[PDB]
Design an enzyme around this catalytic site. Structure first.
Site, PDB file in Angstrom:
ATOM      1  N   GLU A 147       0.782  -1.231   0.000  1.00 41.56           N
ATOM      2  CA  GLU A 147       0.000   0.000   0.000  1.00 41.56           C
ATOM      3  C   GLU A 147       0.814   1.281   0.000  1.00 41.56           C
ATOM      4  O   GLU A 147       0.324   2.330  -0.373  1.00 41.56           O
ATOM      5  CB  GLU A 147      -0.903   0.032   1.248  1.00 41.56           C
ATOM      6  CG  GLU A 147      -1.915  -1.100   1.221  1.00 41.56           C
ATOM      7  CD  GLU A 147      -3.017  -0.997   0.197  1.00 41.56           C
ATOM      8  OE1 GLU A 147      -3.815  -1.884   0.039  1.00 41.56           O
ATOM      9  OE2 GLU A 147      -3.070   0.140  -0.459  1.00 41.56           O
ATOM     10  N   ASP A 171      -6.465   6.594  -4.849  1.00 42.07           N
ATOM     11  CA  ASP A 171      -5.950   5.243  -4.999  1.00 42.07           C
ATOM     12  C   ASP A 171      -5.985   4.789  -6.460  1.00 42.07           C
ATOM     13  O   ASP A 171      -6.289   5.583  -7.340  1.00 42.07           O
ATOM     14  CB  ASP A 171      -6.604   4.259  -4.042  1.00 42.07           C
ATOM     15  CG  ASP A 171      -8.020   3.867  -4.352  1.00 42.07           C
ATOM     16  OD1 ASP A 171      -8.666   3.107  -3.664  1.00 42.07           O
ATOM     17  OD2 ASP A 171      -8.517   4.421  -5.398  1.00 42.07           O
ATOM     18  N   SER A 187     -12.273 -20.073  -5.906  1.00 37.39           N
ATOM     19  CA  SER A 187     -10.898 -19.975  -5.391  1.00 37.39           C
ATOM     20  C   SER A 187     -10.819 -20.381  -3.927  1.00 37.39           C
ATOM     21  O   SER A 187      -9.873 -21.027  -3.487  1.00 37.39           O
ATOM     22  CB  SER A 187     -10.362 -18.559  -5.476  1.00 37.39           C
ATOM     23  OG  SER A 187     -10.372 -18.126  -6.801  1.00 37.39           O
TER      24      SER A 187
END
Ligand code: CL
Ligand code: CL
Length: 164
Positions: free
Chosen positions: A11, A20, A117
């Site tokens: 980050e 972002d 997943s």
């Protein structure tokens, strides 16, 4: 290496309000402020989060405090989630950190959406899960980061983060 270090690599750290990868107002170590297009709305949320009139700027200590709260919350979100909890409990320490990273990034709802997943991780079919995780908008929009998290799930080591 640990979850804090891992996320600090993914980050970064910024002391002033910024946008972002998706164009949303954020600050510190990936702390999302608002999805709203208004910088004022962002400044208002910031001040409310910090408890003082910040003017869009915070200190290192303040960034780290938001970060601690955010990691804690991600963990608690996983443990409270009927779909995520069982996955998390089945994993080893490195892989748990990878799941936390995804939740921190996309929210518990988003991750719980990766039904196939999750089932593969639970079954310990590492290579299969890695391939399935890559068939996602997540991987296509933030491939370098996604590759790091995916490698962690595949190998169960921190190899992708050593050098960074
Ligand atoms: Cl907050
Ligand atoms: Cl990336």
């Amino acid at each position: 290496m640990n979850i804090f270090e891992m996320l600090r690599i993914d980050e970064g750290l910024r002391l002033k309000i910024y946008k972002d990868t998706e164009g949303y107002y954020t600050i510190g170590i990936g702390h999302l402020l608002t999805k709203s297009p208004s910088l004022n709305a962002a400044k208002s949320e910031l001040d409310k989060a910090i408890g003082r009139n910040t003017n869009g700027v915070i200190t290192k200590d303040e960034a780290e405090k938001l970060f601690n709260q955010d990691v804690d919350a991600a963990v608690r979100g996983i443990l409270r989630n009927a779909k995520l909890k069982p996955v998390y409990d089945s994993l080893d320490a490195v892989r748990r950190a990878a799941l936390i990273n995804m939740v921190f990034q996309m929210g518990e709802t988003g991750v719980a959406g990766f039904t196939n997943s999750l089932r593969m991780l639970q079954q310990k079919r590492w290579d299969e899960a890695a391939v399935n995780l890559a068939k996602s908008r997540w991987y296509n929009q933030t491939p370098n980061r996604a590759k790091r998290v995916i490698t962690s799930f595949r190998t169960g080591t921190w190899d992708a983060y050593k050098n960074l």
